[PDB]
Design a protein around this ligand. Sequence first.
Ligand SMILES: Nc1ncnc2c1ncn2[C@@H]1O[C@H](COP(=O)(O)OP(=O)(O)OP(=O)(O)O)[C@@H](O)[C@H]1O
Ligand SMILES: Nc1ncnc2c1ncn2[C@@H]1O[C@H](COP(=O)(O)OP(=O)(O)OP(=O)(O)O)[C@@H](O)[C@H]1O
Ligand SMILES: [Mg+2]
Lengths: 100, 50, 53, 202, 367, 48, 247, 246
Amino acid sequence: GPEEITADIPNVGEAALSKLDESGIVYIGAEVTGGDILVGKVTPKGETQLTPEEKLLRAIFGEKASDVKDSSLRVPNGVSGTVIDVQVFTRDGVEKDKRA
Amino acid sequence: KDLLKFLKAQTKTEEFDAIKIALASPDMIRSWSFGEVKKPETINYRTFKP
Amino acid sequence: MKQGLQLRLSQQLAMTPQLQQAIRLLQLSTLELQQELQQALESNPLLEQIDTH
Amino acid sequence: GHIELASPTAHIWFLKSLPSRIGLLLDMPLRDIERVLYFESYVVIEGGMTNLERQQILTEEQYLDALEEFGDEFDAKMGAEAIQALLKSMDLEQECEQLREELNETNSETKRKKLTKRIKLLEAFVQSGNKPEWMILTVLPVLPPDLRPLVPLDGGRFATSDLNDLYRRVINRNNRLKRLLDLAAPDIIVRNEKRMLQEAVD
Amino acid sequence: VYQGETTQTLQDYLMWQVELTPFSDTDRAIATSIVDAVDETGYLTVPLEDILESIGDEEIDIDEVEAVLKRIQRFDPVGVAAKDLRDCLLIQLSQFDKTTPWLEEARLIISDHLDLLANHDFRTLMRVTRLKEDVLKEAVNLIQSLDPRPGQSIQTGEPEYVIPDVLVRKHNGHWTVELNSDSIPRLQINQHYASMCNNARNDGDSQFIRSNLQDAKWLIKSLESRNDTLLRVSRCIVEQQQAFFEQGEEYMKPMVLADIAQAVEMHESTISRVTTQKYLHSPRGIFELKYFFSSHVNTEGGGEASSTAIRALVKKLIAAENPAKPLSDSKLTSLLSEQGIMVARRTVAKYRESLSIPPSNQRKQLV
Amino acid sequence: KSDDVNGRTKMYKNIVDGNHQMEPGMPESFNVLLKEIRSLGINIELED
Amino acid sequence: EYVFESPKMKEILEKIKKISCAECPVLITGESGVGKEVVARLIHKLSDRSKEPFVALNVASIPRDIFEAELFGYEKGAFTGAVSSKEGFFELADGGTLFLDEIGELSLEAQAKLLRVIESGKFYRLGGRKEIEVNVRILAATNRNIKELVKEGKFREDLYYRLGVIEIEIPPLRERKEDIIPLANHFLKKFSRKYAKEVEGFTKSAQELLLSYPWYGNVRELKNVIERAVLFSEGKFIDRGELSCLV
Amino acid sequence: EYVFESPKMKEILEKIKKISCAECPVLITGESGVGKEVVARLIHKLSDRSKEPFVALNVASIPRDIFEAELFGYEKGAFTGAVSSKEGFFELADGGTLFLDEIGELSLEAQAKLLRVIESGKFYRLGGRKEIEVNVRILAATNRNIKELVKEGKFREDLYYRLGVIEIEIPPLRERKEDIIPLANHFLKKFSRKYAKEVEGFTKSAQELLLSYPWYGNVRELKNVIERAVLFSEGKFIDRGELSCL
DNA sequence: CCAGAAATTGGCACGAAAATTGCAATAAATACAA
DNA sequence: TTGTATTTATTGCAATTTTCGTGCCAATTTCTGG
Ligand SMILES: Nc1ncnc2c1ncn2[C@@H]1O[C@H](COP(=O)(O)OP(=O)(O)OP(=O)(O)O)[C@@H](O)[C@H]1O
Ligand SMILES: Nc1ncnc2c1ncn2[C@@H]1O[C@H](COP(=O)(O)OP(=O)(O)OP(=O)(O)O)[C@@H](O)[C@H]1O
Ligand SMILES: [Mg+2]
């Protein structure tokens, strides 16, 4: 499956996603430091056999958390600044998000 | 059979006091190896296993 | 009239199939096709593959 | 690991590092050794009862006429098999004693230096446990894989390393030579395959 | 030459924490075995009896193994090397401060009744735990705030890709299909040995050379024919499914091998063999060539609707339902009927199961 | 400090424990050199 | 399920248990209808080749002229009309059991062709120059006294000692009077279930008549009599009148 | 691995050794189970053709109408269905040994077909015009009495003198009474090892019982009896009770 | 609140249609010797 | 001028196994009147 850029990362708290807009991209004018999330992305981990422990995990917590793994872009350590510009390049034939 | 001795035996240091160099016999080369390489393939690229 | 095994000169109408050869290459994927091509290269001295070395 | 070579191959360090150990040990010029190794000329192993020396360099037409005249009375070969046969049939003690007698009797300056060098080389070979035919490769060692890793790059491309490419070339040539030898292929092609295997190993 | 560097996995981090922990020799061996038994999600994969057997000494009881395991479970991240989900959640909750508003209720729910929460009862659970709906919502929210997979904090690895065989692109307003030139196999006849075919040369070499030359020519022709057949079949398939590449699924057409076989004038066995383990790259993604063949059901107008479109419609309808009252298969069937799709309840249940979607009673929330 | 794989770990543990002592071993690069020389068809080995 | 109650049948069963670890040829002898095929299939089931083929072959239905081609096979150009290679029965049952049923009807010319294959296990096809080696266990069944045939001269002496490594003889039903009533009850229940009748058992006089009759067809004749009695019954019990076929 | 202890069976071994330098055909006669196959393979092993093929052929298992095709081979186009040339058994066994097992069951029509190949080694393939010459040593074995059959008239006279250059007759086991006990011990050890039992000998009564039975199947019957005794054995010594099958 | 009624789900079964796998030499065109 | 040996051009049929949709019903969950 294809990687998706999204703000719905299952394993992170609500505070870390405060600076991302509805499309999963940081706002213009945000002050960021090392370890902050700039673009949220998930990678399809793939199908499994769905053993009863995995079924229990999916039933109790959810299905989104069990199908994708976080692969976001983060600020490198020892780097800070203000977000002044964001550019989005999309392949022809792919649907554009709201930011684009 | 004891795990302590098994783990301790792979952390030892060899003892030596000299270095020897010479020509290698075909029998010596065969004694070094653990198997014969027959195919030029490296990675399956499908299962990503050797 | 009789059931036996014999050697004789007869005049017969004969049917025969003609399909099986080169049809196995269609089902193979690209990797298996390359492996089979390498195996064919090993045995045939007159076959070569393009190289950049 | 190891690779079983279909035919013997000379070690380039003991051939192309001046002074040539193989040439100085066999008392042959380096040009003749190179010509014999890369399947360009013949060399006599056993002279027989004919007028042929034990290290005489022949050519294709000379070998053909020698065969059509004498027949099965002389043995001639080309490639690394001939060099290994020459190295395997030498007796070091007799060579050493004859060279020492010649050095004691004859007096010169350049010949003195040459005989001294060959005597020292032969006595070094005798004193150590090495044998001359070990300078011709029959089994090829293979380095452990973790010392020659593959390069992983973005997009799922592993590419390749130089050492792995050289190993692949050697293995391909060896396998083709094995298949050609076991099929009784014509000699005009197997000679070219042996030359290419020698070049790949070098 | 860049040789690459070393990375730290979960087990490397756990062993680093083990080495700096005041363990004895036997305790360190037990910890080594336990850390070896931990998988990438942070859960223990073998029973403690296997670890005790692997220690190899008869002087050691299971209680010492339990103590070492409890000590290891407090490493970073907390909850690693847990036996099951209940143990992991209890370990995580044990480290919370006592001032948390709903620690006790969450601990009670996790320790006693975890199957009811998994089955989405929300009715028998209230009776068993004697709680109201005001506190149950907060307790469930606190439970859902924990980490079910503590071992993914040190996640390592890389995705694996696939090289397509045919490329589809929209040029000049119409879709065009070509072969991927980076993966197309090709051969060539060695001109040296081929030109060695001298008539004056010995016949024994000449017959060998001629036979091998004709075999090489036959093999090259076979490869060319295979490539041409693959290109023709792929182009025909893309031409048939032309509305899919412009609007995705829900617009698939129902087609079988007979349609393509009639279109390209070949046998169904050839079409079956060609479209095996071969991929196609489109602006939408990478699809196997067998992805475009599907069954169908009837339609009120008189036409046919593919099963892929019905699965997509079912997923869309389920994903946009009311969490208070989830849709059942009878309700899903009556929603697809207004569009004229004549499908049975059992087929809708089969489609829902194929998408790995729980039944209606197990999807309801506590909103 | 560079390539004694066991020595690095032991030194780190001793430093954290407050014991400033080392147990040096063989550098890994010398083992790599030995393997590389052996791959050339030359028998090089350690004595005693 | 089968019924073994007589002491002789239990002794035969114990022998079958004991010889379960061997791969020797077995020769089964008896009268008609004693249960030779039952014993052969039980031997196959209790052996190490339980999941392997059990090729049962009637050696009297193979034509004389094509006898070799049926058991050994032939290559492509063995004779006129041979189009493709084909295996025999010794190669079809490789790794399993071959059951030669009614071996006493084989003519001497046909018996001479089975000499080397039984012991060696190796043979050549018809038109093949490569030796085929197989691993087949030989069970043979007959209802004629093989020893008497060998002494008379109607059976080859070289084959009896190859086949008769282990010999089992099944006694007639006339000597197994402890085994008659259970068989009658078994067949009665089977046929009552099959035909949906209402019979349940035999009267005491009927039991006496059944036990006193010198059965010549053995279990097959008993089964036929029970089936006829069930078919023509009308009452709850099968009295002496329904068994009017017996004299 | 074979047992040769009787005085009659050692003269045969000496005679086999003495003919190691010969290439004449050999004819082996006896009863059934005496060991004709053992003697034939020992003759082959102790000769100069030790590494050469040993083709054992049951001459009674070849169909009547394809006898020549099997023995000599055929060329392409010889008959309808001959799509390629195929060699025979005389070419298959070229340079080695051909063992015609059970030669006594060959019809008079089939005996006249191999009348020139035995002495000359030259023949023509079916549909072939060139003459083929082979170098094969012929061993034949039979349990009949070939001389008596020739006297009767059901065996060809011209074949007996082509085959019987050297004649070896193996006495029955009932007369080689020095071999019964060594053979019994050999077979007992073999079968005890194979079936993983604990038997290691016979009692005195069992030995006295094995020395009086008139073995009709000879060594094969003895082997069968020992195998039955081992399979049904219980203790460590085979008593007379286990040998009631005699 | 309780218990009977009703709706829901999935394992098994049925026929029908669709996909998969075994089979191995010929038809015809063209250049060459009388 | 022709009859014949050699070289390109043939990428299907026929069983057999597997998957499709949809009905029956036992077990389970949800609903509603007294
Ligand atoms: N002990 C038994 N229990 C149940 N049924 C039995 C038993 N013995 C024999 N039979 C039945 O007897 C019938 C005839 O027996 P079977 O087929 O073995 O005959 P047979 O010995 O091969 O005869 P024949 O020599 O006439 O071919 C079979 O249908 C079989 O089921
Ligand atoms: N001297 C011996 N030592 C050991 N085993 C022997 C000896 N003689 C015969 N045997 C055994 O006796 C068995 C029968 O022998 P063999 O096959 O030679 O008998 P045959 O009837 O003469 O041969 P065939 O009928 O096959 O031509 C074989 O298993 C063989 O091993
Ligand atoms: Mg029967």
